[PDB]
Amino acid sequence: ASVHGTTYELLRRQGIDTVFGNPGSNELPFLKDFPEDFRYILALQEACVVGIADGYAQASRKPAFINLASAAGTGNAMGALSNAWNSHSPLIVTAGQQTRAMIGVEALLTNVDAANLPRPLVKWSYEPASAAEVPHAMSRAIHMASMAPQGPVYLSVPYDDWDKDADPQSHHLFDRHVSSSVRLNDQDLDILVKALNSASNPAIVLGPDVDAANANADCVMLAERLKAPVWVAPSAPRCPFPTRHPCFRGLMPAGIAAISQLLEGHDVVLVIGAPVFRYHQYDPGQYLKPGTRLISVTCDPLEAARAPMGDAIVADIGAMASALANLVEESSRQLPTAAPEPAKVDQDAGRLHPETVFDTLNDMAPENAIYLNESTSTTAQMWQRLNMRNPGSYYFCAAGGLGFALPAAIGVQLAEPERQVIAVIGDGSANYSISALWTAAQYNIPTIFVIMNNGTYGALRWFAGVLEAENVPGLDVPGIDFRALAKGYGVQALKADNLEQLKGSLQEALSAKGPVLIEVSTVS
């Protein structure tokens, strides 16, 4: 067998059946004779390719396979990889290299020092030393992406390798099963459970790796048993808990002092599946107040090492959440009472308040909708206003890199064809990966894109306000017609300049058979 045949068999045997890509000449020998059981999803720029694959992997809870055009294609995707690193997304990023005979002279399209190119944003990065090594290297890439803590990996392959003879002993790669589904030993787990049972006022903080593990329901059971309030760790890339469950307390502010104040009076704080903590703003103070002990369960040694406080356990989040949920006692304390409904913001017949948009989405969207957020100035109100009952219902750029939500919403919608995906994206953010719209049109992936148009980089204006920073250039983005951009890429386009029109536009979008973009005129 050839390296090509053996590699596609390895992929198929490891559950991979879709290639997200934008092709180049070094990749044509990989893509030729493309197997009839595989699906190729084309996107027009590599930030889009990787964003789509990332949404697909996150929602499907399995690795996604990517093929990019040598160094330039890889480089165009590196902002996307920064988000993927922070969300622990299992992405197998492959790129073609020049023919081995032409690497030394650095012919056009030679990826120089290839394995160094995507660092430090990948778990593993490699170029094989021979053609027959390629299937083994691909095996390594699959498993390195998939083992806890999951993450992106990179493999560069000289284009002449594919037609060469494979090692027949590569068949041993095909059915390898590799597990990191592990949890704390019984003795030490019993110590932790007893600490939780003995707490007089426990709190729980949950991060994205809970949703990635589909540990949400187990965490609900855990919070109910412990009668504990539940927060979402700051800068949340995913939603790990039903947002109208009685224990739910919302998104933590991304500040050191703000978090220690929120946790004050809680004697044991159990953090699961989050870094401790993804702060953002400068908000100096105490990491914890006296009287609060923190215990973190994380899938990532790098998270455990860098926490500035608390104990940590490095283990699989699904295995730990299940074990804890089933081992803790039923506390006789009273169950926390549900947060009140958010207020209705006054809304006239003019431009939309973001609060109005979120309330209307919550009113009209199906109860199993999936939301994506890249409307940076409105995140707190989004979290308060969307009832998200189910797992896999929310995604936000995990490293704060704009250009994620628009393509990721297409990948999530491909992963979850029966759940309506609604991406809420600011007018600034919408441009970064605008060409991703084409893929939704071409494959008829019926994502709904809600563009929040206020003409400015709102979150930066606000931050310039808190800095008292005068004369900052580059904060306004006037003069973009998003309906025309949608038309440009073949996506149905609507515009909502007021509440009446927003409702009408959503009704049309929700019953459409294809992707729809709604440009919403929002308040400055």
Query: What residues between 198 and 237 interact with Mg ion by CB under 5 A?
Result: none
Of 438 and 449, the one with the shorter C-beta distance to a second copy is 438
Question: Nearest-5° angle of CA 436, CA 442, CA 447?
Answer: 60
Of 284 and 340, the one with the shorter C-beta distance to a second copy is 284
Nearest-angstrom CA–CA distance, 50 and 30 = 18
Structure tokens at 427: 């007018």
Of 116 and 185, the one with the shorter C-beta distance to Cl ion is 185
Among 3, 19, 24, 162, binds ligand TZD (CB under 6 A): 24
* Binding footprint of ligand TZD, residue count (CB under 6 A): 27
- Interface map 377-416 toward ligand TZD (x if CB under 6 A): xx---------------------xxxx-------------
Element (H, E) at 381: helix 379-385
- Name the minimum Å distance from CB 117 to Mg ion: 5
Tell me the window of 80-88, 119-127, 135-143, 155-163 that interacts with Mg ion (CB under 5 A): 119-127
441 part of the interface to ligand TZD, by CB under 6 A: no
Nearest-angstrom CA–CA distance, 450 and 486 = 12
Among 118, 207, 458, 515, binds ligand TZD (CB under 6 A): 458
Give the chain's largest Cα–Cα span.
Answer: 74
- Name the minimum Å distance from CB 519 to a second copy: 11
Of 16 and 499, the one with the shorter C-beta distance to a second copy is 16
Query: What residues between 36 and 75 interact with ligand TZD by CB under 6 A?
Result: 69, 72-73
190 part of the interface to a second copy, by CB under 8 A: no
- Name the minimum Å distance from CB 499 to a second copy: 25
Is 427 marked within a binding site?
yes
Tell me the three state secondary structure of residue 241: coil
Of 374 and 427, the one with the shorter C-beta distance to Ca ion is 427
Task: List all residues 6 or more positions away from 392 whose beta carbon is below 8 Å from its beta carbon.
Answer: 58, 59, 211, 214, 238, 370, 412, 416, 419
Q: Which does 119 bind (CB under 5 to 8 A by kind): Ca ion, Cl ion, Mg ion, none?
A: Mg ion
* Residue labelled with tokens 């044991």: 268
Nearest-angstrom CA–CA distance, 389 and 74 = 37
* Residue 510 Cα distances to 126, 329, 395, 439, 507, angstroms: 44, 44, 20, 19, 5
Whether the Cβ atoms of residue 408 and residue 373 lie closer than 8 Å to each other: no
119 part of the interface to Mg ion, by CB under 5 A: yes
List of E strands, 207-283: 230-232, 248-251, 268-272
Among 479, 511, 513, 524, binds a second copy (CB under 8 A): 479
List the beta bridge partners of residue 21: 42, 67
Is 83 marked within a binding site?
no
Tell me the three state secondary structure of residue 394: strand
Task: List all residues 6 or more positions away from 479 whose beta carbon is below 8 Å from its beta carbon.
Answer: none
281 part of the interface to ligand TZD, by CB under 6 A: no
Query: What residues between 132 and 151 interact with a second copy by CB under 8 A?
Result: 132-133, 136-137, 139-140, 143-144, 147-148
Is 117 marked within a binding site?
yes
Tell me the three state secondary structure of residue 435: helix
Nearest-angstrom CA–CA distance, 278 and 236 = 8
112 part of the interface to a second copy, by CB under 8 A: yes
Closest CA to 418 of 396, 446, 442, 449: 446
Residue nearest to ligand TZD (CB): 426
Nearest-angstrom CA–CA distance, 359 and 502 = 11
CB-CB neighbours of 447 under 10 Å: 29
5 part of the interface to a second copy, by CB under 8 A: no
Is 249 marked within a binding site?
no
- Name the minimum Å distance from CB 111 to a second copy: 9
| Strand pairing report for 448-453 and 421-426 | parallel
* Residue 169 Cα distances to 10, 141, 164, 496, angstroms: 12, 18, 15, 61
- Name the minimum Å distance from CB 422 to a second copy: 22
Nearest-angstrom CA–CA distance, 33 and 54 = 26
Of 128 and 428, the one with the shorter C-beta distance to Ca ion is 428
| Cα end-to-end distance, the chain, whole Å | 62
Q: Which does 177 bind (CB under 5 to 8 A by kind): Cl ion, a second copy, ligand TZD, none?
A: a second copy
- Name the minimum Å distance from CB 429 to ligand TZD: 3
485 part of the interface to a second copy, by CB under 8 A: yes
Which residues contribute to the site for Mg ion (CB under 5 A)?
Answer: 119
Binding-site residues for Mg(2+): 116-117, 119
Binding site for ligand TZD (CB under 6 A): 22, 24-25, 69, 72-73, 76, 79, 375-378, 400-403, 426-429, 432, 454, 456-460
